[PDB]
């Protein structure tokens, strides 16, 4: 039913080395030349990606910003109220980004802000401005 171990011969590829008297050497030379091909292509991308690595040299350590740990507070000083409005205007609905930019509020605290203040800061209107972007 099956050829010996590690010997490979499908019906198809027998017939393929039969057609002419040099399908033998033809089929074999195609791959010889198809191989040298893929090897030169490899070399290209080694050099291409080697130059791109040189430009990443330094990582981003120069532009890294110290961590800070803010203890989520429940009250909204006028200060961080105003940060919010501006954050909404810029970030739209990115509740995360807003919670970060303010620093001391959780992502839920931001959510219930939208509703609690929707009235007093016309937040609906504000989002429409961000809409146009």
């Amino acid at each position: 039913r099956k050829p010996p171990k590690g010997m490979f011969l499908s019906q198809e590829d027998v017939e393929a080395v039969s057609a002419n008297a040099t399908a033998a050497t033809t089929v074999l030379r195609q791959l010889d030349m198809e191989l040298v091909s893929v090897k030169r292509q490899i070399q290209n991308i080694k050099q291409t990606n080697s130059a791109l690595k040189e430009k990443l040299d330094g990582g981003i350590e120069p532009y890294r910003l110290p961590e800070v740990i803010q203890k989520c507070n429940a009250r909204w000083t006028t200060e961080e109220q105003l940060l919010a409005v501006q954050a909404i205007r810029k970030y739209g609905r990115d509740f995360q980004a807003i919670s970060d930019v303010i620093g001391n509020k959780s992502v839920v605290q931001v959510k219930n802000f939208f509703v609690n203040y929707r009235r007093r800061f016309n937040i609906d209107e504000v989002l429409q401005e961000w809409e146009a972007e």
Partner: protein, 666 residues
Amino acid sequence: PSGVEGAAFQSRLPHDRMTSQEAACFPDIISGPQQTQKVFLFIRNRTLQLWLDNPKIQLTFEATLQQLEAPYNSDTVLVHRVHSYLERHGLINFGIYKRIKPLPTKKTGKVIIIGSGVSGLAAARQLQSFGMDVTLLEARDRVGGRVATFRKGNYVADLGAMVVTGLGGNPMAVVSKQVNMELAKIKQKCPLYEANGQAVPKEKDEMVEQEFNRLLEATSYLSHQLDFNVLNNKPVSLGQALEVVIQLQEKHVKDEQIEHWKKIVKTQEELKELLNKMVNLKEKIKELHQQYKEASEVKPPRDITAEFLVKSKHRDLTALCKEYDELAETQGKLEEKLQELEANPPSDVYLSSRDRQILDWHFANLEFANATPLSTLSLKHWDQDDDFEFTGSHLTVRNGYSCVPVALAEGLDIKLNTAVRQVRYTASGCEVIAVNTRSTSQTFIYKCDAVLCTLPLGVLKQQPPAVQFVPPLPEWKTSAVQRMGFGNLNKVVLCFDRVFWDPSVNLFGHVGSTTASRGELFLFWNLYKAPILLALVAGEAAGIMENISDDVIVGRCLAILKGIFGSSAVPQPKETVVSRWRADPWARGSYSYVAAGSSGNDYDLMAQPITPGPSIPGAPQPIPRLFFAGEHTIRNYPATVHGALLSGLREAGRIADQFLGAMYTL
């Protein structure tokens, strides 16, 4: 190997069933009730058992009946039929026995036999054993034909047949008892030595051998499963099949490599895309950070919009700094993977050239066994006799195989130096025309009821014909002769004084440099008591080495023999012989092979006897007159001694049934 059942096996018969031959002579029984048959087989099997655990003496009907146990006693005619049948078809009372009753006073019927090869001799004895008048005609000055032993002083080497290929079912088992043959086993270890004179590394040897065996299986699968047995409406050789298979491996070696390097570049390109994303994000960062710094530089107090800017810029930056790390993570995974793909590269070659050479030795060994280039063997059929090979070790005949024909030729009318030239057969009888080999002009004429042709297939093939048939042979016969293959294989005998090789090693090989000359002296044999080394010429090489003088050939041997062993240890040889089996005109080659385009069926054609046309038109159907035996008549044992023998025995049966009648079919 136990019981009467063992005698059946030792006589190539199924203990539990009736053969088709037996059906023909005992149609009543095989047609009959189960029980009657079961009886028959025992009577048969038992009788055989008797013959063979003592084949030194005739086994009579009474002697057999003697060892009879009921209900097997009951029927005395049955026992007689059986014993007669067995005796007729040389299953018992063959070879060399002591007779009980000296021969019948008077002979009956006259037969001429062509050739005193084993096939000839076997039948001659049988016929004479059945009291016909028999005369053999040998062109040679000696019996045996392709059994040819060389003798000088204590040097004894076989140039022809040398091996008994197992004893389990072999007739020669029985002959071995009847004649003193010194049967010695063969040690399988065969060390190889490349051109340099340096053994092949044990690791290599094992791999290539294993590859070779796989390459064969390959072809068989290739033949039977993929049905790849025609190409350009020409039948496919074994050599073609191998070439094909090899290429496909060589090809698949490449296919792997390609697929592996393509897996690399697919990843190499995923990385390129990442590295861009990375490099661009680094720029957005550099520049953004700058902005944040500037926004931070604005000393307070400051209104809320300026405050917001710092925060927004601060967050926008830590956000971009997150992305980049996720990417440098992704990068490290792809980067390590790349080096692991690079770590395990699919194999570079299928086989080297130093390999391909060693492989070519294993092929030469195959061309040796079948005595022909693999380009000539039938892919479908070359190994058709593999199912009937005997059991047990292969032995040499140490004292020279010639012992066996010579033994057989005792008390036989043998005209040596009598070359048959023409064979005429008619309804009336036949006449054979020979000549003396020494004075070709001196002419002989023999008349007989029947002729038995044991002419070698090479002779039969000869064109223009060495022997002429009158009338000429039917096209069905001659076509078979054309289709069948008659190979060649040659031995070189080296008689030294000192044993300068390893005596614990029976045989060792030498690896020829090229495919073309893989046959040349590719294998050597210390198999004899004396200090004697044989060297084989096989394959394409055999045919060509038959135009090189003895001296040159021994030159080449000695040279080869100094690589392995060193110019100090290798003396000149005292006596040397080289064979030339294809040039030998009473042979025209070595032995048959199922050539591409033939089948084992042709072997059966060559055994069919020939019946002449009637003398007077509308006269009754004649009796057949011309019969055939030899190594090429026996489908299941071709190209061996035992087959030659068996073919002789067989005809002796066919002939006697014709000319003495069969009193056992009652």
